[PDB]
Amino acid sequence: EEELQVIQPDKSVSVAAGESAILHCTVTSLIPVGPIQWFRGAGPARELIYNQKEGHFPRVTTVSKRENMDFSISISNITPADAGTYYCVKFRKGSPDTEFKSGAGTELSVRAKPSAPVVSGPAARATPQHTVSFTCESHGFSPRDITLKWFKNGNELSDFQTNVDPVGESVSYSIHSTAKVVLTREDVHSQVICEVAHVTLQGDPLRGTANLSETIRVPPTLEVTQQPVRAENQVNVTCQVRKFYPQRLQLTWLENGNVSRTETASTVTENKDGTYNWMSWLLVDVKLTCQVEHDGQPAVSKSHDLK
Numbered sequence: 001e002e003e004l005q006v007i008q009p010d011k012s013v014s015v016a017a018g019e020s021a022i023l024h025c026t027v028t029s030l031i032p033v034g035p036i037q038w039f040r041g042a043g044p045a046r047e048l049i050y051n052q053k054e055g056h057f058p059r060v061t062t063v064s065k066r067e068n069m070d071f072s073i074s075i076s077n078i079t080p081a082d083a084g085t086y087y088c089v090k091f092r093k094g095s096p097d098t099e100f101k102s103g104a105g106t107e108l109s110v111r112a113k114p115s116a117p118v119v120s121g122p123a124a125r126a127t128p129q130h131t132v133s134f135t136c137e138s139h140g141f142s143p144r145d146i147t148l149k150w151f152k153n154g155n156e157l158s159d160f161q162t163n164v165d166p167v168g169e170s171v172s173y174s175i176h177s178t179a180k181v182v183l184t185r186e187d188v189h190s191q192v193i194c195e196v197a198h199v200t201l202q203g204d205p206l207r208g209t210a211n212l213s214e215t216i217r218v219p220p221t222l223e224v225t226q227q228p229v230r231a232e233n234q235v236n237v238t239c240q241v242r243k244f245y246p247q248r249l250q251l252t253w254l255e256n257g258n259v260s261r262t263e264t265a266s267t268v269t270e271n272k273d274g275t276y277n278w279m280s281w282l283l284v285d286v287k288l289t290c291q292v293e294h295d296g297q298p299a300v301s302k303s304h305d306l307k
């Protein structure tokens with residue numbers, strides 16, 4: 001009978017997060033007498049995973065009598081934090097029991113899905129033809145390999161920068177990406193999309209969206225005119241506030257620098273591009289000024305004179 005050998009037939013095992021991992025180990029001899037123990041890591045600070053003779057290991061279960069020679073284990077509910085190299089080790093009986101021979105080790109790698117991509121646009125709004133940044137973020141996947149793409153309404157974008165961290169080794173990875181997007185006057189109904197592809201994903205990439213309606217500001221055009229009034233000594237003066245977004249607009253009517261009336265747009269019409277239209281009118285050497293404050297921005301105004 002040849003001397004006891006500890007045999008770990010698998011150099012590496014790959015498990016999906018949440019599943020059970022099987023770590024195989026068989027010993028060739030029953031002598032010398034002593035327990036088999038499982039560890040993660042070797043040398044300094046190795047972690048006891050299972051002890052055949054005593055203790056509680058709820059996650060550990062035996063995969064196989066006194067002539068038992070198979071010491072394979074199963075570990076339930078795997079997480080990325082279980083990744084590492086596992087060693088099956090034979091000890092000689094004693095108090096305490098001394099180490100005798102170690103298996104060659106089995107590397108356990110764990111597969112985790114990326115989290116749903118979160119897309120954030122800038123803090124303040126911008127007008128058409130401005131460039132704005134969007135950030136995309138996804139965490140906790142392994143392996144490190146991943147693919148990130150950006151789209152604006154279906155067209156893939158190219159102007160972006162991506163980072164995966166750690167650059168070094170870890171159990172889970174994160175991805176962070178920033179894309180530069182040029183706003184047009186048609187973006188109220190537009191959407192920016194960040195999609196990630198990973199092996200743990202059954203064909204369909206995870207997507208994160210951001211609606212440009214939250215980011216765009218389209219300033220109103222003003223137009224002040226005068227209408228025929230039946231009664232004499234009266235003129236209908238109108239201000240048309242057209243094609244604006246969002247719908248937050250305050251309008252003050254002025255008479256030679258004197259506040260005649262203030263108003264908030266309440267019932268607007270909508271255009272095909274998602275912007276709104278509104279109009280205010282009042283019955284009146286004299287100047288009339290239609291003064292507008294759109295979405296908390298600096299007042300703009302058109303002035304008009306009396307017949």
Ligand SMILES: *[C@@H]1O[C@H](CO)[C@@H](O)[C@H](O)[C@H]1NC(C)=O
Nearest residue numbers: 227236237238279281282283
């Ligand atoms: C002033 O003109 C507007 C725009 O045509 C109209 O809707 C409004 O009713 C007019 N005011 C009066 C008193 O007719």
